[PDB]
């Protein structure tokens, strides 16, 4: 009846037709059919992305690939709890009004000049999107932007609004690239290839600092704003109070343990996922310090994402067990033999960068990182590189409305068109493809 319902039923027909008409070994065809089914469900978002995550195990058990608990244990990978600690910290420095005070304390340094305050906004947004979230910080910042731009006109010099808002949302989606926490695809990659915090920052932070100024430049040049002006913000200013400095101490200590986590771990006894134990310790420090209450951490966190991590991991483990990934790798051996590596990562980056515009970031990553990480384990390639690339590119959703929520938050206001976003995001996605390809080809060496 409904559209998505027809999508699902066509998906089931496709899966049955594959399962029956694909002449292979049973496990190859089973994994192929599950992959097609899950993919069509994770791109079209017929069923909530997390419902499909849940459905992955149910089809990994009902066909004998796994024992129930061996599948359900995918939903407890230490990266899930690292992201839960990230959500706890976000809730602490939101409920306790830390992010807002940070923003106001930055803007005030730009005494009254918008020309520097907008770049302050971009820096702040990409400095908070690391930890807090991509949607939440964009929603928090849009009011600040409008307060910055209540002076200027909305129809005459509208390019200024487009610049400010797009830069904000772009900066959120980018700053999400700078920490495991910050965007789910980071964690999907890390869990699929076993990465730490500071063993992922090495790929994230340089990329974010090399891609954010790029995007700001391309906005400033495709759009010719009138950023000269004065700055009148109307809200009761904020100030440091006990409970915020405590939260800052806890947050800084947690980040410190996260960064220097190998030297500390070795000096403690060598535990496997010490960043996750740092995250849990952050939860406990916060709760024992009373800055946050678990009700906030449960109202804020997105447990759908935390079930998605497990669903994608189970799909990875399915493509592993069934040897589907190896079947493909053997099927694509000649093409990838002729194609080097530069072309491989170029194709991957192009595909995901122009995909996540139409699909979601988290779902697209959960779908592809398993596929390509396994197919790369088969080929010998390092799954770390491809997983990181697909987690960094899936964030690049700069082209149109809901591809990331931030774009849609901005394009709720109505001061930006669609065509301008399409053009800007096209140029930006090309440049980001170039940048990802270059910094990857570097990290290879």
């Amino acid at each position: 009846l409904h559209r998505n319902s027809l999508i699902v039923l066509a998906d089931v027909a496709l899966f049955l037709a594959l399962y029956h008409f694909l002449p292979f070994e049973h496990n190859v065809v089973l994994g192929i059919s599950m992959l097609a089914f899950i993919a069509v469900l994770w791109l079209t978002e017929a069923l909530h992305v997390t419902v499909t995550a849940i459905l992955v195990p149910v089809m990994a058990v009902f066909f004998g690939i796994f024992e129930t608990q061996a599948a359900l244990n995918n939903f407890a990978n230490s990266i899930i709890f690292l992201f839960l600690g990230g959500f706890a910290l976000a809730a602490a420095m939101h409920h306790q009004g830390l992010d807002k005070v940070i923003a106001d304390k930055v803007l005030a340094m730009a005494q009254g000049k918008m020309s520097v305050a907008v770049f302050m906004l971009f820096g702040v947004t990409a400095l908070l999107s690391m930890w807090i979230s991509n949607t939440a910080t964009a929603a928090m910042m849009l009011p600040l932007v409008l307060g910055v731009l209540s002076k200027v006109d909305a129809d005459k010099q509208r390019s200024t609004y487009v610049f400010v808002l797009l830069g904000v949302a772009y900066s959120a989606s980018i700053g999400g690239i700078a920490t495991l926490v910050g965007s789910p695809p980071n964690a999907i990659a890390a869990a699929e290839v076993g990465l730490s915090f500071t063993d992922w920052m090495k790929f994230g932070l340089p990329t974010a600092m090399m891609m954010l100024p790029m995007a700001i430049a391309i906005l400033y040049f495709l759009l010719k704003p009138t950023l000269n002006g004065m700055f009148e913000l109307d809200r009761a200013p904020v100030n440091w109070d006990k409970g915020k400095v405590v939260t800052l101490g806890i947050f800084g200590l947690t980040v410190f343990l996260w960064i220097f986590s190998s030297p500390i771990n070795a000096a403690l006894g060598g535990f496997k996922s010490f960043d996750t134990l740092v995250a849990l310790g952050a939860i406990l420090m916060l709760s024992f310090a009373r800055v946050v209450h678990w009700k906030e951490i449960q109202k804020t966190a997105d447990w759908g994402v935390l079930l998605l991590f497990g669903g994608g991991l189970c799909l990875s483990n399915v493509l592993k067990q069934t040897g589907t990934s190896v079947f493909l790798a053997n099927a694509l051996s000649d093409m990838v033999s002729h194609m080097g590596i530069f072309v491989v990562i170029l194709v991957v980056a192009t595909f995901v960068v122009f995909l996540t515009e139409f699909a979601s970031n988290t779902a697209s990553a959960a779908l592809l990182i398993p596929v390509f990480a396994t197919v790369a384990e088969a080929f010998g390639m390092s799954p770390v590189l491809l997983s990181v690339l697909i987690a960094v590119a899936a964030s690049c959703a700069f082209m149109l409305p809901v591809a990331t929520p931030p774009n849609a938050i901005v394009f709720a206001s109505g001061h930006i068109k669609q065509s301008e976003m399409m053009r800007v995001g096209l140029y930006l996605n090309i440049a980001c493809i170039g940048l990802l390809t270059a910094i990857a080809m570097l990290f290879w060496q």
Partner: antibody
Amino acid sequence: EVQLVESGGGLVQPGGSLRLSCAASGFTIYSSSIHWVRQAPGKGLEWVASIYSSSGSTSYADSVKGRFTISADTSKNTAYLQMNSLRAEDTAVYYCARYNIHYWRWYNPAGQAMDYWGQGTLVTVFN
Amino acid sequence: MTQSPSSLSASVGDRVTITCRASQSVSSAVAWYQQKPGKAPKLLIYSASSLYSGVPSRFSGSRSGTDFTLTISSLQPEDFATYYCQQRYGLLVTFGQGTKVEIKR
């Protein structure tokens, strides 16, 4: 704990046929690739064939395509290399190694690259 | 894939290096093997440089593009053997042409 025992290697005539078996213990063939490696008579190592049974995906070397055929039945553990149309330039000491690929994220005695080979079955094509 | 040098004349205590060029710049699956005459090869390094459990620390590896490389810091009298590089690409393997280190005089 883990070991691979190679059998079926012996005398043969050209245009003939033989069949080596590589019985495994300590792991499951289902979760690893099996690799058949003829060294040479008094020369260096040469790779011949490979199989991943979970998929049935086999890869022969460019020198043995319509002459060899690898196979594997799980449920005990095995990896058979049926050699056919054996030529004079095929006498050697065939080893059978395991290569784990995927790291499996939970647990396995799996190794990661040809850690555990065997001892060698010598086949001597003969006139 | 192609492995150089063919033969190495190295005295004990010396540091020796071996190079292996791949010609398929996709697979970082290069592993290094130590074979004594007639015996089964013994693994040292698996991906390109990361060491194996049961091997001395003097056996190090490097990638440097496609010019994979093996390094033995202190050449001990038991490290005189034949060294091979294998590159897995998918399911198919291919070893190196063979490197032989001999105690010089």
